[PDB]
Amino acid sequence: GTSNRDWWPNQLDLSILHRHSSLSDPMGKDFNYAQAFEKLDLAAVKRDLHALMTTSQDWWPADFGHYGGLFIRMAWHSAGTYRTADGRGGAGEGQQRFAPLNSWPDNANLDKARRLLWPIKQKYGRAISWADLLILTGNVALESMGFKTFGFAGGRADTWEPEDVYWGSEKIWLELSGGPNSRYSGDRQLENPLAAVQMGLIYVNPEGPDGNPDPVAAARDIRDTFARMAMNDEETVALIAGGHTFGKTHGAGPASNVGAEPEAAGIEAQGLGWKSAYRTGKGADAITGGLEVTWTTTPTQWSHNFFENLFGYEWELTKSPAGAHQWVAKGADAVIPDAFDPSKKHRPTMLTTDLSLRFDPAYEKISRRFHENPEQFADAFARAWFKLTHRDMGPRARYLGPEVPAEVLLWQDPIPAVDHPLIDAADAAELKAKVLASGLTVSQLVSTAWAAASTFRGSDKRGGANGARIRLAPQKDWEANQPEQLAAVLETLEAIRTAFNGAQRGGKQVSLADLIVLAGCAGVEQAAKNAGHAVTVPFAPGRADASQEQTDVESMAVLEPVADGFRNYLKGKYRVPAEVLLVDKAQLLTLSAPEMTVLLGGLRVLGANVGQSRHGVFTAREQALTNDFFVNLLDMGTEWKPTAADADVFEGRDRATGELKWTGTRVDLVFGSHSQLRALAEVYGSADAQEKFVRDFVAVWNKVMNLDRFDLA
Amino acid sequence: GTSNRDWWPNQLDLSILHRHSSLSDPMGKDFNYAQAFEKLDLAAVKRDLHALMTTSQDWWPADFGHYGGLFIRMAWHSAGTYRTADGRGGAGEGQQRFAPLNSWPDNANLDKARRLLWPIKQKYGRAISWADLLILTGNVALESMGFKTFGFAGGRADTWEPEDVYWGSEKIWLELSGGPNSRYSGDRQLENPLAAVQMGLIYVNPEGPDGNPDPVAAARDIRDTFARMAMNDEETVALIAGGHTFGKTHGAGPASNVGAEPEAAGIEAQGLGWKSAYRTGKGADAITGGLEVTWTTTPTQWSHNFFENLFGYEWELTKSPAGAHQWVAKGADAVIPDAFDPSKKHRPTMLTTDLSLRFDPAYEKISRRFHENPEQFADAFARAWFKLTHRDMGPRARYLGPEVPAEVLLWQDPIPAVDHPLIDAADAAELKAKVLASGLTVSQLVSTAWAAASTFRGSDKRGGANGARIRLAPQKDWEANQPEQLAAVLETLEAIRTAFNGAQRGGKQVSLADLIVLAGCAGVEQAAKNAGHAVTVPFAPGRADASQEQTDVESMAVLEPVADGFRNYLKGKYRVPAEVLLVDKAQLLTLSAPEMTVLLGGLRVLGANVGQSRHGVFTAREQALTNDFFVNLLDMGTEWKPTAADADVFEGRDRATGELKWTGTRVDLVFGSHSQLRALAEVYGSADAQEKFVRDFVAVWNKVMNLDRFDLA
Numbered sequence A, B: 001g002t003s004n005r006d007w008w009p010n011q012l013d014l015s016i017l018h019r020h021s022s023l024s025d026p027m028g029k030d031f032n033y034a035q036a037f038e039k040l041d042l043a044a045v046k047r048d049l050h051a052l053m054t055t056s057q058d059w060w061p062a063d064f065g066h067y068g069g070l071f072i073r074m075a076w077h078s079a080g081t082y083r084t085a086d087g088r089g090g091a092g093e094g095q096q097r098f099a100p101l102n103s104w105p106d107n108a109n110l111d112k113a114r115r116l117l118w119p120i121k122q123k124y125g126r127a128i129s130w131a132d133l134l135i136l137t138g139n140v141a142l143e144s145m146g147f148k149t150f151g152f153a154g155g156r157a158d159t160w161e162p163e164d165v166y167w168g169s170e171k172i173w174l175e176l177s178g179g180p181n182s183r184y185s186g187d188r189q190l191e192n193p194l195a196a197v198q199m200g201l202i203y204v205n206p207e208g209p210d211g212n213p214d215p216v217a218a219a220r221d222i223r224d225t226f227a228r229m230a231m232n233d234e235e236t237v238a239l240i241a242g243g244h245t246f247g248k249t250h251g252a253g254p255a256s257n258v259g260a261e262p263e264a265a266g267i268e269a270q271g272l273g274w275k276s277a278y279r280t281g282k283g284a285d286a287i288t289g290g291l292e293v294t295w296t297t298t299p300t301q302w303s304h305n306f307f308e309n310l311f312g313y314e315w316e317l318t319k320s321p322a323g324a325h326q327w328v329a330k331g332a333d334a335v336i337p338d339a340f341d342p343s344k345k346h347r348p349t350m351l352t353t354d355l356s357l358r359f360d361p362a363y364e365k366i367s368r369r370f371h372e373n374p375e376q377f378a379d380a381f382a383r384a385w386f387k388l389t390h391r392d393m394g395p396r397a398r399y400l401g402p403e404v405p406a407e408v409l410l411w412q413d414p415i416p417a418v419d420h421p422l423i424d425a426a427d428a429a430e431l432k433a434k435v436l437a438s439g440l441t442v443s444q445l446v447s448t449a450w451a452a453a454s455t456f457r458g459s460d461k462r463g464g465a466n467g468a469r470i471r472l473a474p475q476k477d478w479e480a481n482q483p484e485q486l487a488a489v490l491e492t493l494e495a496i497r498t499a500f501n502g503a504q505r506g507g508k509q510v511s512l513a514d515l516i517v518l519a520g521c522a523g524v525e526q527a528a529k530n531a532g533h534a535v536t537v538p539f540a541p542g543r544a545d546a547s548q549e550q551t552d553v554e555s556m557a558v559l560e561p562v563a564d565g566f567r568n569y570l571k572g573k574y575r576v577p578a579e580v581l582l583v584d585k586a587q588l589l590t591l592s593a594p595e596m597t598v599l600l601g602g603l604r605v606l607g608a609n610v611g612q613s614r615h616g617v618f619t620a621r622e623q624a625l626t627n628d629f630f631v632n633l634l635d636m637g638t639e640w641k642p643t644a645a646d647a648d649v650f651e652g653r654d655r656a657t658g659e660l661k662w663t664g665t666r667v668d669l670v671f672g673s674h675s676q677l678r679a680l681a682e683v684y685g686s687a688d689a690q691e692k693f694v695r696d697f698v699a700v701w702n703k704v705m706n707l708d709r710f711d712l713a
């Protein structure tokens, strides 16, 4: 059946903005997952998970009698899809159970692990999400095997369909580099936003880069991918050596024995895949990835043996029973236990990527320190594991349950507690009046508040106006934020704040975070007044100001908007058309197509464009909140053509006279071109729509201002 | 960007069930289009439309000074995509303005016609939908030109995205038949549910079948396609001759001058397409389809000149300036006006498909009667035009405004007015008790009510339990409805009804339509009681009973369920997998994925299956309303295999013992296979879900019962 995607494959796709509707969701409108989890008996769940570790099922028998290794792999894969570039992936939505991740080659036999969890999921029902349960299961595995974790937070709500994520352009699973859709170019430069080396891998190829078993060159890939998942050298070494303290790989026979992944398997498979024709197909005969490595002498217990082996032997290249490259210890005794036969023992083995920890000079120093100081390894691995599994969960206000660690970590972008009375409605009226009396313009106020709030992304719940990080490095210097204009606005607002706070009794004070947002509200209100409308914008106080020492400058860099169509801004020249980047930003902000449409048409006429560009400012009353953008964009009296100078800029001329009326970019004109967007634009451009436009504007403005307000959730 | 549809192109697609969410809709959640339209000043709209017919715009100048013919073409294409097989297409949702219809080749230059309407759309805003406005424009065109229409109903609410419709499998616009995705097979048999001869056409090829200009063979295609749009011979003649009383075709130059269709055009085109390089590109030089025919001597006035010409001249084959086949009267004087040059005149011309009206023997008899009696032609054309443009609008209760025709037409599946007091809650409770005391079983009651209600389809809003047409031909004999069991149930219900109605005073009586639905309610309540839960199923009286004389038997045939996965029924053996047919039927019933999932799992354990098949009845307490379907489907203790006898039937056996527990079909097992459906099944199969299952089941059951109750809107 031919579809629109077939006829027009480079059309903009808006269905990404309408995923996650109440239509697809089985829970009712009012279901609140946080409230459900807070009443779960987490201790009971954890007891059942401990029991499960050693209750082997015959359709997927436990290695060594203990599922712990399988489940730690499951949890690290759940978290391991995370990319800091866009915040997409990670464990926070339980996407491992949906396509494509449920069928990625690197997730082979994790369908078994998830099915082993069904009886527990079933018992506790809606009070524990699959997303939380995957991570909890990983923690319990660690604990069952003697490793004390740093803590755990619940609160990851389940989702009900696949997320739309760009995972690459390759059309072949696991395709090696330099193909027609290569993710690499140059000197092994991985394309953003990707964070894996091959399609359907978590991070790197365990045999080495493109299958070449060079540990030193493998280390370069590990360092780049892990960096792209927000982990530094110490965290990377602690996580790989920690993980590979446990369990084994599965490569007992040729991979051509393994059949269809879950989304390709027959209906009778009931959700499972990778059925193997090799011997019994499971257990001692299991085939997962093709390697056959067991790292330690006690694969079901925490030990210091990973580093003892890594350093204690010299390594020789060999092949697994499936033919993959791997390493064996020269001259060693058979000291490693077999997973099923108590009469068999094996020589120590390693992956190419494990040897990276010893042969990359920077990793070697870390691995040596951990080898010599195993308590330092244990503590780093606990911290790193918590970071791994919580990195996309958002502000600490979202963390639920009795095991949340009290220590505040830099990577959480922490926001100080509020310890004083908050401003009330009378005070907010007085501050808005002082803001309007200072001489700050509509355009300044709206631009500043937009810049502060619009860093939010829903993918990992980072960013937003809480913290007043707009005043700190690096946000205060970002090009999109108009550093010199921003500094003059912050200077005026900080003087207003100091004067208000100095006049208070009791401990009452306003944060600069709240004042930035309240000042934006005042700008909106004034813009409405300019247009003849009486509008109050809602404002919720309670934001606090973070310090520079609570603000990791390097980790903040991934939030910089290099494309922000809501400010008609594009930092350079990209492969992806600007309208596509607009819809991607709308998705990170959590906006639907109508909300993206209303919001952009309002921002244009309010003067939010970077550099005060006239592109898209289709009004003769700038700084007044009207639906002029829409009425004028849709006027068929105006004809549009791309300029000679720049094909991505357009001139709108009176079709009868030839006179120049407007200029616009592709972000602007897409609202008059794309058939779905133009239908939205027409609702807002109609003669009955001025009041609807204003109201809908204020609503979406307020939404954006509150996107990080998990303290109010 | 590789997607799930790329990796797994044959997986089931659920997103068709979640189109039309509150997310995509710009109007607020409480917007009610009927309330808006009822206050429209319809007469004012019509006066603006009248004016517009003769106000030419320079960017698409009006032929003959009058846009009438273009707008009649626009409205017939809006209505003309309708297929009786599934009720999809038609004018009822204004889908011409979205992809792919906005860019079909047969809709070329209709983008201009819709743009000419924007000033009026804009003026009246939400009080007149696009959907309504396309049809109303065509009525006003007819009226402006001297033709008395049969009336007009508003009430078509706008939609905000493309509907998912199967339009064919060809990958080339306008592909001739016999290709690798041919829609024809056998002796020119067009595949169901299609109703056009080539991809991107409305019905037929105006040059003849696959371009062969044989009027006689073109008549066979006309007859078949029109029949598939629900129009018989008299209606088809009246409509083609009617339409071609007006206007002209456009073929001033070679078609290679025409550029990209709207969805492929540049952003500067602002939603328009088919930009032409031939001379001025428009007006006298217009190119639309490539033919150059003007049928009558007065193209802007109703006449009987189409048939005067068709019969009054002998025709000869010739070629337009773009090279398409068409017909000329060479014997004639130059009597037809030129569209732009008052000093030019032309000979009469016809399409091959117009000559079909004279050279197919059955059409000729009709055309002759219309020729000789043009008042009969006018009346037939008015009735057919109303039918054309209203055929997918649903029950007369949805018709809005001051121009609705009072005559009730058989094609409307009419429902008699109710002139008597309705039963109240106490009466409904006494009827439910009498139905349960009669001895009718939960299975019989549920099966009957399901069979009566589940004929509904949202595509054209035909079907449903209103009317009690389950007791009439043909519904009473459909195999899915189990005609002998159905007759025994209806006989018992009719005796209950006669007894209750005979005992009333004051005119109070219950219809059989309402009693069938209330009896289904009693069955569901009793099933809940059997499981130990006291529930009340909501019930809304006011249905009426239609007579056999008010029921077109032949038109009802397209509503027969030949696949109904909710009753595990498949009438024969199809090319499309049964699970795909299930999602199709869900979409026609307007169900989301969660509602489809709850409903099917409840129906299974209530005994709704056709034939009392055990397939999917995964319970040991049949006729009790429990979540057993889901608990037992999801039990990993059971292993599934396709039977030797039938690959579409599966045995569920205890995995340890091999004992046979259950059998199921693909419709059953897809809920255990598809990763999104299995996530839904899990919610209902969890230990905390009994209450939720029952509530959600009653809610969807009630929804289904009420699908056709537009009298309560």
Ligand code: HEM
Binding pocket: A063, A068, A069, A070, A071, A072, A073, A076, A203, A204, A205, A206, A222, A239, A240, A242, A243, A244, A246, A247, A248, A249, A250, A251, A287, A288, A289, A290, A291, A353
């Ligand atoms: C460079 C990064 C990594 C590479 C290339 C890698 C590679 C692999 C491979 C190839 C397997 C075998 C799969 C099979 O055939 O069953 C696996 C198993 C496993 N890995 Fe990793 N790994 C990485 C990082 C991690 C991390 C960060 C952790 C956790 C903190 C982890 C914990 C595990 C565990 C516990 C297993 C054993 C599974 C079992 O016993 O079934 N690994 N690893």
Ligand code: HEM
Binding pocket: B063, B068, B069, B070, B071, B072, B073, B076, B203, B204, B205, B206, B222, B239, B240, B242, B243, B244, B246, B247, B248, B249, B250, B251, B287, B288, B289, B290, B291, B353
């Ligand atoms: C066998 C069915 C039909 C065929 C093959 C068909 C064919 C066509 C074609 C090829 C054109 C020329 C398009 C262009 O180049 O501008 C057209 C024009 C038109 N058709 Fe039809 N037609 C069909 C039925 C109908 C019906 C049912 C109606 C309305 C009741 C209709 C009303 C019109 C009108 C008014 C025009 C003139 C457009 C203008 O003046 O711009 N036709 N027809």
Ligand SMILES: [Cl-]
Binding pocket: A088, A089, A090, A095, A163, A165
């Ligand atoms: Cl994601």
Ligand SMILES: [Cl-]
Binding pocket: B088, B089, B090, B095, B163, B164, B165, B459
């Ligand atoms: Cl449709």
Ligand code: NA
Binding pocket: A087, A088, A089, A090, A092, A392, A458, A459, A460
């Ligand atoms: Na994420």
Ligand code: NA
Binding pocket: B087, B088, B089, B090, B092, B392, B459, B460
């Ligand atoms: Na329809």
